Structure 1
């Protein structure tokens, strides 16, 4: 009916969506905390809906496979299994063909996460060598950027990152970050996430600048009436200062000297 609970697809990703720590078992939406849960609470209040947070069944953001089919949160929306995707879901032209997005709630670009104190200063520096491995999270927009790029350097990088003996394309962010911390490996990832990670890991740094410029939006199925309503709500949250409050809350830290 009109007041049905909305199914919200999302994915574990620090600090957007995390398991809340508790001495006792937690259940339902209370299992989760993070920037996206705060955003979802605000949207639910403004737009007057109830919601059920469900982790994406395949643990993927979404890419089109060799059969031409989508996976991840994008597929959950296409197949109407979810009403909304509230996650750091990158707005891209290819995704806009199959799902709708609100206007962006946060901006980002791809860059490089690596350790401090090395001679590696740019993507070019990584691309021209083979000792240091590098890659990206599988089945997301960063992977797709490299896979589809026609820029010489990024074509070379794609060829390398998709052809290592131990796959350099990692399952999720946490796996990639651990690889940067424990082996000679650099992770291509989004600047939002790099800022979070580098503040919590003072031996790590961003290498170079941003190599593209994009936004995150709330995803909906094509034609959903919630898309425009969520755009309006995001504008309200921005004007009120609430997006700034949420960013400060979840990117809080002591800095790195």
Structure 2
């Protein structure tokens, strides 16, 4: 056996640097839902592991020209990591190049506003121009809009793709900060899981509005045909059935609530 290299991403409350731990070593530096999940998966599957943060800070997309995968997906595709344990969305284009476990969490695209913003739905956003809106610049949310044939979402993409200045952000934290600083003139499209987390964080000035725009899941990813895929998949189902995933959700979202 060898130590399994885990790629993950700094995304609250999934993986966070513990206060004042920057200069410590190894796995103990990090906390969060995916840190606890990695420990359980590794225990059930009988492996030792090293948590690493994805070098480019991205989830994963294929460049249109170079055909090269970036982010966590790229780390798996090019053999830089053995497994990705992160809020990584199961998508068709990714499933074509890596393997996913059954989902460990359900989510959908959602709208985050600064409280008091006169927006209730995606339709509302699409029918006005005063309030700008965008997504994480690389990720499954952007791709959702890029590919949608649904009238409202196609309209939103036509606006977003050419809006100036760019409505896209490099990180979730950047999108949240942009909502908070924009006096109601920027809304952020992000996954319901993140949105619901931030809604319960100080300064308690954002909220989720409207229903989810889609329904999907996060999965644990391994390189195609990995020795780990089968056991990891069975482990996710065991964690689900043993109530552990619900325990972790309660721990990191609502037990954490500051609002």
TM surpasses 0.5? yes
Query: Would the aligned equivalents of 2:21 and 2:29 in 1 still touch at CA under 8 Å?
Result: no
- Say whether residues 1:18 and 2:16 are aligned partners: yes
Q: Deviations over 1:31-63 (max 9, x none)?
A: 211100000001111111111111111111011
Corresponding residue for residue 37 of structure 1: 35
* CA RMSD between the two structures: 1.5
The alignment partner of 1:186 has SS state of strand
TM-score (ref. length: structure 2):
0.94
Corresponding residue for residue 64 of structure 2: 66
Corresponding residue for residue 252 of structure 2: 250
How many residue pairs are counted as aligned between the two chains? 254
Corresponding residue for residue 218 of structure 1: 220
Q: 1:121 to 1:72 in 2, by over 3 A?
A: same
The alignment partner of 1:206 has SS state of strand
The alignment partner of 2:119 has SS state of coil
TM-score (ref. length: structure 1):
0.94
CA positional deviation for 1:157: 1.1
Deviates more, 1:116-125 or 1:134-143: 116-125
Corresponding residue for residue 50 of structure 1: 48
- Say whether residues 1:140 and 2:139 are aligned partners: yes
Corresponding residue for residue 208 of structure 2: 206
The alignment partner of 1:90 has SS state of coil
Deviates more, 1:105-114 or 1:26-35: 26-35
- Output the CA distance in 1 between the equivalents of 2:127 and 2:158: 12
Q: Deviations over 1:192-231 (max 9, x none)?
A: 1111011115321112101110010001011113122111
Corresponding residue for residue 7 of structure 2: 9
Written as runs of structure 1 = structure 2, the 5 A alignment for 1:88-167 is 88-167=87-166
The alignment partner of 1:112 has SS state of strand
- Output the CA distance in 2 between the equivalents of 1:78 and 1:25: 30
- Output the CA distance in 2 between the equivalents of 1:24 and 1:194: 27
Unpaired runs of at least 5, structure 1: none
The alignment partner of 1:165 has SS state of coil
- Output the CA distance in 2 between the equivalents of 1:253 and 1:246: 11
Deviates more, 1:147-156 or 1:95-104: 147-156
CA positional deviation for 1:255: 6.7
Query: Would the aligned equivalents of 2:22 and 2:29 in 1 still touch at CA under 8 Å?
Result: no
Q: Deviations over 1:127-159 (max 9, x none)?
A: 122221110111100011011111121122112
Corresponding residue for residue 25 of structure 2: 27
Q: Deviations over 1:42-93 (max 9, x none)?
A: 1111111111111111111011212233211111111111100000000011
- Output the CA distance in 1 between the equivalents of 2:241 and 2:21: 38
Corresponding residue for residue 241 of structure 1: 243
- Output the CA distance in 2 between the equivalents of 1:24 and 1:217: 28
CA positional deviation for 1:6: 0.7
Query: Would the aligned equivalents of 2:90 and 2:100 in 1 still touch at CA under 8 Å?
Result: yes
